[PDB]
């Protein structure tokens, strides 16, 4: 399997699935390095974030646990097709990149906070991460290039 991917067992259904311990992605389907990647992200900050403030709210008071619940909800809506990643990033990302539908542009290794870099480089083009924790908060990352 590709970097980070492992086989796992559904607790509710008993069917095999695949989990990536670098990106926190999970999926039923068997999974399908670059010098630079282009990613978008959706950030949900919390009270332990290095800077608990964003364009959305001056004092961010939600707990890490609450942030993770919000991230999980956004992932659910994205995966069901109820909402687009770009639309959720524009509305709800605690990063100024929200104004560009979450797009960060292209970057190489040795530029981003480490969990974010590692997730970004382990995604294939078009793939989305699970919840990725950094000192910034919790991210959903979409690799676009």
């Amino acid at each position: 399997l590709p970097p980070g991917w492992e086989k796992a067992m559904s607790r509710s259904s008993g069917r095999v699935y695949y989990f990536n311990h670098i990106t926190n992605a999970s999926q039923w389907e068997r999974p399908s390095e670059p010098a630079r990647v282009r990613c978008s992200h959706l950030l949900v900050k919390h009270s332990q974030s290095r800077r608990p403030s964003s364009w959305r709210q001056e004092k961010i008071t939600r707990t890490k646990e609450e942030a993770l619940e919000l991230i999980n909800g956004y992932i659910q809506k994205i995966k069901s097709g109820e909402e687009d990643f770009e639309s959720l990033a524009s509305q709800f990302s605690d990063c100024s990149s929200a104004k560009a539908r979450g797009d960060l542009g292209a970057f190489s290794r040795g530029q981003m906070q480490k969990p974010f870099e590692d997730a970004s480089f382990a995604l294939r083009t078009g793939e989305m991460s699970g919840p990725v924790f950094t000192d910034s908060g919790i991210h959903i990352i979409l690799r676009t290039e």
């Binding site: 950030l43 981003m112 906070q113 480490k114 991210h139």
Partner: peptide, 5 residues
């Protein structure tokens, strides 16, 4: 600046 090292 945001998730930049």
């Amino acid at each position: 600046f945001x998730x930049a090292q």
